[PDB]
Amino acid sequence: PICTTRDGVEIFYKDWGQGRPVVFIHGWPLNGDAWQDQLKAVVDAGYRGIAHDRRGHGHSTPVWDGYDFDTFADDLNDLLTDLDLRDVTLVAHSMGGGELARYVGRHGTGRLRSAVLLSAIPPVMIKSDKNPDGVPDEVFDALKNGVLTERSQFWKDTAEGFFSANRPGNKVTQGNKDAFWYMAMAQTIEGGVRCVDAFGYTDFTEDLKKFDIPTLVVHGDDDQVVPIDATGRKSAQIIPNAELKVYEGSSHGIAMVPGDKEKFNRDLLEFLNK
User: What is the DSSP string of 114-176?
Assistant: First the structure.
């Protein structure tokens, strides 16, 4: 289905089931198909599962502008308002965690019950003297140059790090890598590069302090994209009352990789009863 935003943008989304709503917010450079395993899991447990495609991704309008967290959060606000959703759990992966954080910062928690941050970017990714465990600027430069040099090959090469597929004995399939590429080919090239600038450099520390709902932070300690020590370990300390679950040996692609995705589904379903 399509939600038309305040600006006339069409946001595509899946809306399955009946019950309290669980809204899933995907990472770069994918789309709501990155959550089909979790959407089935929550609807089979008696929840309504919704997953939208960010502007410029999947089947949403291939826009030029608005690749910034304030716009992503307002687009999320339009979807929650159009469907008049209440008592919602927002579940976000990777840069989707910035959309979730900025939604709380801008619109508050009146429609929300709880939140889940899976392998998410808050509080801030960029390395500096204040954040010595963050990601160096050269990495973000390299991501943007990869998308501009030849994006199709770049997604094939990036899938290796995304799933930590360099680890001997991993459970990542060739299919996982092919599906990563398939989802990424639907993203605009401008969303490809502008999202890097947004997720690398935006600081969500002040938004995190406004959380007043139960929050679960899950993060793998072999995440080669979003470093656990700079992000998940810190957001769990800033968000009031947050719980942290470290997934030993897990990559950045926990929701899609065999074995890890069942562990996450089990944790998510336990948390949803809160």
Answer: EEEEES---S--B--SS-TTSB-HHHHHHHHHHHHHHHHHHHHHHHHHHTTTTSTT----HHH
Are 52 and 32 a contacting pair, CB within 8 Å?
yes
CB 160 within 8 A of CB 177: yes
Which among 201, 205, 206, 208 has a CA at the least distance from the CA of 239?
208
- Resolution at which this structure was determined, Å: 1.8
Residues with Cβ within 8 Å of 56's Cβ and at least 6 positions away in sequence, in order, are 62, 63, 67, 187, 188, 190, 191
Q: What residues are annotated to the active site?
A: 94, 223, 252
**Mind listing the domains of the chain with CATH numbers?**
1-274 (3.40.50.1820)
Q: Closest Cα to residue 211, out of 121, 90, 118, 130? A: 90
Cβ neighbours around 203 below 10 Å, total: 16
For 31-59, the DSSP string reads -GGGGHHHHHHHHHTT-EEEEEPPTTSTT
**40: burial class by Cβ within 10 Å (0-12, 13-18, 19+)?**
middle
Packed helices 96-107 and 69-82: angle between N→C axes, nearest 10 degrees: 70
Q: How was this entry determined?
A: X-ray
Buried b (16+ CB within 10 A) or exposed e, 226-255: bbbebbbbbbbebbeebebeebeebbbbbb
For 17, the token pair is: 């089931």
Place of tokens 């959380």: 211
